[PDB]
Design a protein around this nucleic acid. Structure first.
Ligand SMILES: Nc1nc2c(ncn2[C@H]2C[C@H](O)[C@@H](COP(=O)(O)OP(=O)(O)OP(=O)(O)O)O2)c(=O)[nH]1
Ligand SMILES: [Ca+2]
Ligand SMILES: [Mg+2]
Ligand SMILES: [Mg+2]
Length: 341
DNA sequence: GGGGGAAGGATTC
DNA sequence: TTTTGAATCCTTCCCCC
């Protein structure tokens, strides 16, 4: 099986450039302003010019500004980015029937049945990069290999505006040399539990006792890593159906005073429902992020779809179940809906 | 012993 | 004054046959 992965380059920042070309060349930083105070919030993403100087996703807007005080700072426009993405995705649907839309800027194409070797694949990759750059003037990076995991790793090494293939021989090379932390699905917390069992490479996972690994990272991660080490990872490019829609917002100030919180929670529901658009959820979860940034959540499932009026009522019941079973103040309150009919 | 759903956990977009 | 926000798939817990 041959996999072709497409990962839009610095997408949010790039889509902004596409709507205001004058931005090209200058460092652009797309922000998520929180509103607690002047320039509060974090950076959603920055084009490469900005990244060169330490301005990247996650860093507070404040700091980003100390580094590049004269950069173009723009407020995130998800809706807009979403629509461009949809279009770009529909372009990809013309290179394969089997397409997996991982995120707003990532899709996997099963091009086994469309090409035969990595040369023919690699060409289709360029044909794809072009079609997109033509129809939407957006640069992307393509990853090609035997499975989704290594396809993605290709793209990771190539971006931006790149394209790379990882043949069966190199997959084996990487199984030995690639830093296990640079494997899709292995975040910091898990990297540590590993880049700690002497497991700093994929291959290493085959030499340790299974149970030891399982006990540390979990049965699922353990099997995931093992299978990759053995070169038997072949997940199918399946269609992902969104399974939950929600919205969580930052309050002007921390609190555990029910009335004071109600407005924010209702705004979250309002927006949540607008986003649900026709989808009917039989499950609701009130999510709270405390002052010390921990996550607390209570939810209920109904044998029927939830009406917005119901959402409102039950949410308050859940927010109360939170306030009662926790004594920490709350900083962020939101809601999340699932189990669509 | 294990199916199955609630709450926290972590990853990553 | 971090610190943002959305959605997932994983583990862990208790209920129940
Ligand atoms: N709201 C929000 N969006 C983020 C954040 N980090 C990344 N994103 C969004 C922007 C991108 O479209 C998508 C990014 O994907 P990745 O983290 O793989 O980085 P990549 O370099 O592919 O994306 P980029 O376009 O560079 O931001 O997720 C964040 O902290 N907050
Ligand atoms: Ca990207
Ligand atoms: Mg991405
Ligand atoms: Mg990692």
């Amino acid at each position: 099986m041959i996999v072709l992965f497409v990962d839009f380059d610095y997408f949010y920042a790039q889509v902004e450039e596409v709507l205001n070309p004058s931005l090209k060349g200058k460092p652009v930083v797309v922000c998520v302003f929180s509103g607690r105070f002047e320039d509060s919030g974090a950076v959603a993403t920055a084009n490469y010019e900005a990244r060169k100087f330490g301005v990247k996703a996650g860093i507070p807007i404040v700091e980003a500004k100390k580094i590049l005080p004269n950069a173009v700072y723009l407020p995130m426009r998800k809706e807009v980015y979403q629509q461009v993405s949809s279009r770009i995705m529909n372009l990809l649907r013309e290179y394969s029937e089997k397409i997996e839309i991982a995120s707003i800027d990532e899709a996997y194409l099963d091009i086994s049945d469309k090409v035969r070797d990595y040369r023919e694949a690699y060409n289709l990759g360029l044909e794809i990069k072009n079609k997109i750059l033509e129809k939407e003037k957006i640069t992307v990076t393509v990853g090609i290999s035997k499975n989704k995991v290594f396809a993605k790793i290709a793209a990771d090494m190539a971006k931006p505006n790149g394209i790379k293939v990882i043949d069966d021989e190199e997959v084996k090379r990487l199984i030995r040399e690639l830093d296990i932390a640079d494997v899709p699905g292995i975040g910091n917390i898990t990297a540590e539990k590993l880049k700690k069992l002497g497991i700093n490479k994929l291959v290493d996972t085959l030499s340790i006792e299974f149970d030891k690994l399982k006990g540390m990272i979990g049965e699922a991660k353990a099997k995931y890593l093992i299978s990759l080490a053995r070169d038997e990872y072949n997940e199918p490019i399946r269609t992902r159906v969104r399974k939950s829609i929600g919205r969580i917002v930052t309050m002007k100030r921390n609190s555990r005073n029910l009335e004071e919180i109600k407005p924010y929670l209702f705004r979250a529901i309002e927006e949540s429902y607008y986003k649900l658009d026709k989808r009917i959820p039989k499950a609701i979860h009130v999510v709270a992020v405390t002052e010390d940034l921990d996550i607390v959540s209570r939810g209920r499932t109904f044998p029927h779809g939830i009406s917005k009026e119901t959402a409102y009522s039950e949410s308050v019941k859940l927010l109360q179940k939170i306030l009662e079973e926790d004594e920490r103040k709350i900083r962020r309150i939101g809601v999340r809906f699932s189990k669509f009919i």
